[PDB]
Amino acid sequence: IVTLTRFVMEEGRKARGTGEMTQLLNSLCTAVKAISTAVRKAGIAHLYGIAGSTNVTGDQVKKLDVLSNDLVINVLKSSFATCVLVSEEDKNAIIVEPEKRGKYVVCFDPLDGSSNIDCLVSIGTIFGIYRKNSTDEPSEKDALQPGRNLVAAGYALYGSATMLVLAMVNGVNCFMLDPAIGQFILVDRDVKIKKKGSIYSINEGYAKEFDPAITEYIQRKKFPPDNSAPYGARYVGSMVADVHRTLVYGGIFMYPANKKSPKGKLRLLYECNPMAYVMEKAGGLATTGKEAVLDIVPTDIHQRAPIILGSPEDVTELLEIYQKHA
Amino acid sequence: IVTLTRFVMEEGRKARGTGEMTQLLNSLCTAVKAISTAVRKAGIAHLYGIAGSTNVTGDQVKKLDVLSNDLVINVLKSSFATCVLVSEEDKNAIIVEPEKRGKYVVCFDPLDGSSNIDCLVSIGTIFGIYRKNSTDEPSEKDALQPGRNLVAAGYALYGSATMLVLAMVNGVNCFMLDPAIGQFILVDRDVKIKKKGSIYSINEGYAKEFDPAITEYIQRKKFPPDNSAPYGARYVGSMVADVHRTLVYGGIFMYPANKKSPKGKLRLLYECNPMAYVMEKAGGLATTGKEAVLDIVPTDIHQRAPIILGSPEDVTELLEIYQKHA
Amino acid sequence: IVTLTRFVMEEGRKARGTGEMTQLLNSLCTAVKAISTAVRKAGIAHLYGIAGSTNVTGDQVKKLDVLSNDLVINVLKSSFATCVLVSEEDKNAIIVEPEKRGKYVVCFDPLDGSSNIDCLVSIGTIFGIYRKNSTDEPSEKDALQPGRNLVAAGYALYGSATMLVLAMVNGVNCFMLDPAIGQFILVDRDVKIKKKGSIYSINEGYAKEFDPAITEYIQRKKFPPDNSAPYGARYVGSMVADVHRTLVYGGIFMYPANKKSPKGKLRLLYECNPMAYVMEKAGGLATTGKEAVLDIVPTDIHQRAPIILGSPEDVTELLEIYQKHA
Amino acid sequence: IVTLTRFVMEEGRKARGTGEMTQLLNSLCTAVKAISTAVRKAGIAHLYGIAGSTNVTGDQVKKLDVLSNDLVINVLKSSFATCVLVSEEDKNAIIVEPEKRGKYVVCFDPLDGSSNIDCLVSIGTIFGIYRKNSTDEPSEKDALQPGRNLVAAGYALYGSATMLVLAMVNGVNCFMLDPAIGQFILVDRDVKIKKKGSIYSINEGYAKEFDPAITEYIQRKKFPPDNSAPYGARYVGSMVADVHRTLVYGGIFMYPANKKSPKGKLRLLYECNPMAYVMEKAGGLATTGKEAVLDIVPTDIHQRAPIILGSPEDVTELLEIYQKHA
Ligand SMILES: O=P(O)(O)OC[C@H]1O[C@](O)(CO)[C@@H](O)[C@@H]1O
Ligand SMILES: O=P(O)(O)OC[C@H]1O[C@](O)(CO)[C@@H](O)[C@@H]1O
Ligand SMILES: O=P(O)(O)OC[C@H]1O[C@](O)(CO)[C@@H](O)[C@@H]1O
Ligand SMILES: O=P(O)(O)OC[C@H]1O[C@](O)(CO)[C@@H](O)[C@@H]1O
Ligand SMILES: [Zn+2]
Ligand SMILES: [Zn+2]
Ligand SMILES: [Zn+2]
Ligand SMILES: [Zn+2]
Ligand SMILES: [Zn+2]
Ligand SMILES: [Zn+2]
Ligand SMILES: [Zn+2]
Ligand SMILES: [Zn+2]
């Protein structure tokens, strides 16, 4: 019934927009349609393997990884709606050549879950969008706002299906890519997380590194003091994959700070913030254990943050723990 | 270059076959092409949710689950190459009406990873093929052979891509579904597992239930006595998804017997055996901790078995443990 | 490189639009993507045959015919950019419910070449767009403008490929539907017809009915007085199919008035006008033999007109004839 | 329900075959799936234009033209079922390297309707299959049998849909390519032509060249002596396109010998014969005006023949004429 496109134009309808969210969100979707198409044949298309570079916070790039990044860069650029761009894959913020400038700052991870791709696990793209608040001719700093300054954010999941999750001030709506007519059709609106979940999602290979709170927490899920059944475990390795399952089934997802990394592994700008925004607009929470992610004022574009997101009841149970040990 | 179809005809070429493996494997592939197509649009196609029944060893069925089962049943039937069929989803072995009979017994899980489908995690189909050894007019018992009596087995993965993994006496070759021309094109031959892995794959939500061996083992991966780095964890929830990653990256996958279930959860006939066969033909191992899976003589079609499969070095490390506690 | 969508937004960029051409043209394209998808499987989709009705100027409807009509009606409606709609398939002009009204009047033949569909010949969709010029609350009459009052017009060809031909004041640009990513990509801009052609395109089954001018003309192509080689003949039966070939190869297309029908067979509003507009914006001509089609002021929405369009040199040769006999 | 593949295996079922028709017909279909995929995006895929060569009886080649030819050559080769191949596009018969030899001689036009492709008119592939009758180690001459020596023949139509028409001793069955699952599904069996048609299909641009019979005939369709309505005309320019329409709607198709070319334009081996075979197995006729096409014993592989095929009532009306003038 309702295409993605219709939905934004209608929303913008009564928000009395000028509509350059619309071009922008429309310029994104095609990329999403392009990334995904390639991914589904990434094997015959000889894309699995590596290009040859280390990402800014130290990851090994793959041909795909560049492909989608360029593409997204290009379509945002030509959308006429963005002035500053931040990407997984570039040292430095991209500024947009004035003829094409717009009021928008789009942070993004073009293809997250790098590990997963050879083993054909689900992969996704992540974005977050802010309004420039500045008189100042546009600069890198226009990206350094807290997550609470988002006007729109979500992600694409190239799983068993392709899906576009979008969060906007009004709430969360999922669309699913129809491969046949290549159009994003709306499958769930306006989504909400369970108050409490049955699943826990973390890499326990760092058991030796976790702090006492995470350690106590994880053990509470395996040995419930109430004697209820213990949460199931699930950890795919693709953040977008897990977030999503957390989102639809409820429960928790944790990429906590370990001993090794003061602030966790996941990038604040284009990974942690978007997912938190969604989570909060779905009615869940997103904490580091100490602060709301959404409130952190970034200083480095490429900066990391520990992240705990999920059904609030669960996210609180932990916070409570962290507080107990504070 | 080489279609799936070419590959089997060529293999059968020098094996001096009559060729009804070929029809049979060809009658499978289309189903695989049909299951997958549907899965990628399972949302617009209103397939997510439930039909209304409990599978034989107690699972909740979904519309999809039936769809693919019928389809596979139908295409095997019409292949002219099979006499007895065993399915996840039927109490009783299917016998084939004589005009359509063949020398083949095909066990199979039409769509495994039931949980995953709503959250768009990877899903797959699993099969194993035996030759009837019997004068006797065909019966259910023709399925009760050990796994070592397999002539062919593998699985389909509807992940970020669609992939057909096939194991035959000669070894393991992966094909990848080209969505465009709808043909299974060959991506890896003839595959082999690492002697040793870096990843561990189990549901630790049953920590309280595991036996001491699994318990000691899991802890060895988190706290290496050698002081090496601890294995990463990964558990998607779809056996085919994990097996595959284990297969391509190496490491271990465990669905061990717990306190609750004497023999684990995974069905011997159409889940455990195929994956073991592949694993062994890839050069890995597949144990219960006490016996080779391949050697177990089944008595109940629908029977379960604990299963530990993977890079041999890892699979042995555990066996050694289990032996220590024997 | 350039999507259809980009192209219109850019054009509208410097035309200083409000942009509701854009939604409108974007709301069209999806239909085009939807009509076409269905057509390519119209056989397995059991769409070939008939629904059960006679179109306003006396044609037999087919399930498809309705399908695409509804769809186009729906997407234009929801575009927010149109007040009055005229369709092959409705007695009466459609007015749009005010909340959804726009400044646009779109005439259209949802699926032309009805005959062709069972035999899998090329089929197409045709449209023309006018601006309402009226204070008056919108009515049927808003459609009765001459063709010269068009702001945009073109057609879709579901041939061996799918193609979107668009004519706008600035000229003619062809896009081709990429089945893979389902996006209209630009293949030719900004198109032009040969001054003179080598092909003639008419139904000679009405030889007995044609007027002396057409009769003399057709014979001149078969027996050139200059002793040059005689034009090749080509007549597919789908106007959009022939127009297009005329457009790319050059030459002439004729659906002249016969003895039987004072004014030919082809509908002025949503067949003759669009094709003339394109033809003129491609630099060709479009005559009845007596008047420019573009200048005819219509009185009946569903009214017909004889039409002769093509490379001008050829279109003139005829006019000259018609004049000689005037 | 029934895939193409099922259908041949079943037919071969009771014909007590060894089954290498089956591989062969299966090795064809994929090509058909490959040719077609490319054609639908021949524009974005930059395939429209020319490679640079003149075909054996004097046609200008295009990149596509080679592409599909190679492909078909390759898949037939690897089918293991063919010893001698004849193609539009090669001076000389192809012999097959013994390891891959089969009992089959396949004549074929890889992509017919060359003209049409830029204007996106329908295009097709044409084939005919004979059994080698020779002790003699295989040579070019194995192709020089009359059309009556065909075991199987038909064509592919990349029209608005993709369609596989197949004629076998038993009759005519049409399958239609499902783009989605990329499988040839059966749409009509076992087809038959009208005893009499309402349409005539010829290039009247050669009016000046036609013989008196064709001339009188064409005029009879425009001026019926019975005073019935005159046949409609239709001529697309792609033989496969017209044949097909003739096949489904009935009527006549003519590529008669003209003054200029003693024997017409269409190649006997891989154009005229297949279409005649189909026509006769559909219950229609296929004449030169003097002889059955099927009975002509060829001497040159690349040789042409005039061809008149269609509903028999119509095809006879003409013969009668030709006889009257004999
Ligand atoms: O394997 P690890 O250490 O758990 O990290 C994987 C994480 O990294 C990412 O691939 C991005 O770095 C996430 O999608 C995923 O959660
Ligand atoms: O959630 P659990 O208890 O780990 O079980 C999930 C397992 O069950 C299956 O869905 C089949 O039962 C496997 O694919 C998967 O490994
Ligand atoms: O078969 P006829 O009489 O030439 O009419 C066919 C014409 O009618 C249409 O199908 C629309 O009526 C045109 O596309 C086509 O040119
Ligand atoms: O344009 P002409 O001279 O009628 O020839 C076109 C004929 O040639 C072919 O393209 C093959 O030569 C046929 O498909 C078609 O009927
Ligand atoms: Zn990334
Ligand atoms: Zn990432
Ligand atoms: Zn199952
Ligand atoms: Zn299962
Ligand atoms: Zn119409
Ligand atoms: Zn029409
Ligand atoms: Zn050809
Ligand atoms: Zn040809």
- Both tokens of C103, joined, read 């400044």
b/e for D125-156, b at 16 or more Cβ within 10 A? bbbbbbebeeeeebeeebbbbbbbbbebbbbb
8-state DSSP, B60: B
- Please tell me the distance between residue D111's alpha carbon and the centre of ligand 11 in angstroms: 4
Q: Do D204 and C187 touch (CB under 8 A)?
A: no
For A19, the closest of C13, C19, C27 (CB atoms) is C19
Collapsed DSSP state (helix, strand, coil) of residue B292? strand
Say which ligand is closest to the CA of D239: 4
Would you say the CB of residue C30 lies under 6 angstroms from ligand 3?
A: no
- Ligand 2 pocket member B65 (CB < 6 A): no
Identify the active-site residue in A59, A209, A211, A317. Answer: A59
Q: Could you tell me which chains touch chain C, where touching means 3 or more CB pairs under 8 A?
A: A, D
- φ, ψ of residue C130 to 5 degrees: the values are -115, 155
C-alpha to C-alpha distance for B260 and B271, rounded to whole angstroms: 20
* C-beta atoms of B179 and A119 within 8 A: no
- What number of other Cβ atoms are within 10 A of residue D282's Cβ? 23
Strand (E) or helix (H) holding A54 = none
- Selected for mutation to probe chain C from A4, A6, A35, A37 (highest C CB count within 10 Å) is A6
- Among B4, B24, B64, B65, which one carries the catalytic annotation? B65
Contact C248, C137 (CB under 8 A): no
State residue B126 phi and psi, 5-degree precision.
Answer: -135, 140
Quote the tokens at residue A154.
């979500």
B230/A161 CB distance under 8 A: no
| A271 vs A88: CA distance, rounded Å | 9
DSSP characters over A75-94 = HHHHTT-EEEEEETT-SSPE
Rounded Cα gap, residues B244 and B157, in angstroms:
8
Q: Which residues surround ligand 5, an ion (CB under 5 A)?
A: A 88, 109, 111-112
CATH number listed for the domain at residues B1-190: 3.30.540.10
Q: How many angstroms does the Cα of residue B112 sit away from the middle of ligand 8?
A: 3
Burial of A65 (0-12, 13-18, 19+ CB in 10 A): buried
Token pair belonging to B241 = 């998804």
Q: At what angle do helices C63-78 and C20-40 cross, to 10 degrees?
A: 160
Minimum CA–CA partner of A12 in chain C: C80
Give the angle subtended at the CA of D172 by the CAs of D214 and D34, to the nearest 5°: 95
B160 closest CB neighbour out of A122, A223, A234: A122
Residue D45: closest CA among chain C residues belongs to which residue?
A: C178
Distance CA C308, CA D291 (A): 41
User: Pick from D30, D80, D182: which is nearest to B9 by CB?
Assistant: D80
The H or E element that residue B294 is part of is none
Nearest by Cα to B87 from B272, B290, B269, B306: B269
Range list of H helices, chain B:
4-14, 20-40, 63-78, 212-222, 239-249, 273-281, 312-325
* A135-155 core/surface letters (b: 16 or more CB in 10 A; e: else): eeebeeebbbbbbbbbebbbb
Beta-carbon contacts below 8 Å between A and B: 146
d(Cα D26, Cα D24) in Å, to the nearest integer?
5
3-state secondary structure of B59: coil
Tell me whether residue B137 is one of the annotated catalytic residues: no
Beta strands in chain B (DSSP E): 82-87, 94-95, 104-112, 123-131, 150-158, 162-168, 171-178, 183-188, 199-201, 232-233, 252-255, 266-267, 285-287, 304-305, 307-310
Q: Which residue CA neighbors atom 3 of ligand 4 most closely?
A: D203
Inter-chain residue contact B80 with D13, CB threshold 8 Å: yes
Question: Smallest CA–CA separation between D147 and chain C, in Å?
Answer: 26
Q: Side chain identity at B245, as an amino acid letter?
A: R
Q: Which of A115, A118, A119, A242 to mutate to test the interface with B (most CBs of B within 10 A)?
A: A119
Spatial CB neighbours of B137, under 8 Å, sequence gap ≥ 6: none
The torsion angles phi and psi of B271, rounded to 5 degrees, stand at: -125, -60
Q: Which two tokens mark C30?
A: 């999806």
Residue C268 alpha carbon to ligand 3 centre in Å: 13
Find residue A70's DSSP bridge partners. Answer: none
- The residues on C that touch A, with CB distances below 8 Å, are 3, 5-6, 9, 13, 19, 23, 26-27, 30, 33-34, 37, 78, 80, 180-183
Compute the nearest-CA separation of B241 from chain A (Å): 7
Please indicate if the annotation marks A128 as binding a ligand: no
State which of B255, B260, B263, B309 you would mutate to test the pocket of ligand 2, scoring each by most atoms of that ligand within 8 A of its C-beta: B255
D181 contacts in B (CB within 8 Å)? 30, 33-34, 37, 182
Task: List the structure tokens of C196.
Answer: 């003179």
Is the C-beta atom of D113 inside 6 A of ligand 4? yes
Q: Which of B225, B253, B239 is nearest to B157 (CA)?
A: B239
Give the nearest partner residue to B117 out of A116, A122, A160, using CB atoms: A160
- Our CA-based measurement puts residue A34 at a distance from the nearest CA of chain B, in whole angstroms, of 14
Q: How many CA atoms lie within 13 A of C115 on its CB side?
A: 12
Domain boundaries, chain C: 1-190, 191-325
The amino acid occupying position C14 is K
Residue D138 CA to its chain's centroid (Å): 24
Q: What gap in Å lies between CA B7 and CA B187, rounded to an integer?
A: 12
For residue C182, the Cα-to-chain-centroid distance in whole angstroms is: 23
Q: Is B90 a catalytic residue?
A: no
CA distance B83 to chain A (A): 32
Question: Which of chain A's residues have a Cβ under 8 Å away from the Cβ of C30?
Answer: 3, 5, 181, 183
Say if residue A88 carries a ligand binding annotation: yes
Closest CA to B24 of C309, D9, D58: D9
Ligand 1 in reach of A238 Cβ (< 6 A)? yes
3-class DSSP string for chain D:
CCEHHHHHHHHHHHCCCCCHHHHHHHHHHHHHHHHHHHHHCCCCCCCCCCCCCECCCCCECCHHHHHHHHHHHHHHHHCCCEEEEEECCCCCCEECCHHHCCCEEEEEEEEECHHHHHHCCCEEEEEEEEECCCCCCCCHHHHCCCHHHEEEEEEEEECCCEEEEEEECCEEEEEEEECCCCEEEEEECCCCCCCCCCEEECCHHHHHHCCHHHHHHHHHHHCCCCCCCCCEECECCCHHHHHHHHHHHCCEEEECCCCCCCCCCEEHHHHHHHHHHHHHHCCCEEECCCCECCCCCCCCCCCEECEEEECHHHHHHHHHHHHHHC
- How many residues are present in chain B? 326
Cα separation, D132 vs D103, in Å, equals 6
A118 is catalytic: no
Is C191-325 assigned to CATH 3.40.50.1950?
A: no
Index of the ligand 3 atom closest to the CA of residue C265: 12
Reduced 3-state DSSP string for chain C = CCEHHHHHHHHHHHCCCCCHHHHHHHHHHHHHHHHHHHHHCCCCCCCCCCCCCECCCCCECCHHHHHHHHHHHHHHHHCCCEEEEEECCCCCCEECCHHHCCCEEEEEEEEECHHHHHHCCCEEEEEEEEECCCCCCCCHHHHCCCHHHEEEEEEEEECCCEEEEEEECCEEEEEEEECCCCEEEEEECCCCCCCCCCEEECCHHHHHHCCHHHHHHHHHHHCCCCCCCCCEECECCCHHHHHHHHHHHCCEEEECCCCCCCCCCEEHHHHHHHHHHHHHHCCCEEECCCCECCCCCCCCCCCEECEEEECHHHHHHHHHHHHHHC
What six digits make up the tokens of A312?
Answer: 């609030």
Question: Does the C-beta of B49 come closer than 6 Å to ligand 1?
Answer: no
- What's the CA dihedral at C217, C222, C224, C228 to 10 degrees? 130
B5, D30: Cβ pair inside 8 Å?
A: yes
Q: For D279, phi and psi rounded to 5 degrees? A: -65, -40
CB contact (8 A) between residue D181 and residue B182:
yes
C4-to-A30, A287, C8, C153, D41 alpha-carbon distances in Å: 11, 42, 7, 14, 16
Smallest Cα distance from C50 to chain D, Å: 15
Q: Establish whether residue B139 lines the binding site of ligand 2, counting it when its CB lies within 6 angstroms of any ligand atom.
A: no
- CB-CB: which of D121, D176, D221 is closest to C122? D121
Chain B residues whose CB is inside 8 A of the A121 CB are 122, 159-160, 236, 241, 245
CA gap A109, A132 in Å, rounded = 20
Coil/strand/helix, residue B160 = coil
Contact A230 B207 (CB under 8 A): yes
Cα-based torsion angle of the residue sequence C51, C56, C60, C61 in order, rounded to the nearest 10 degrees: -30
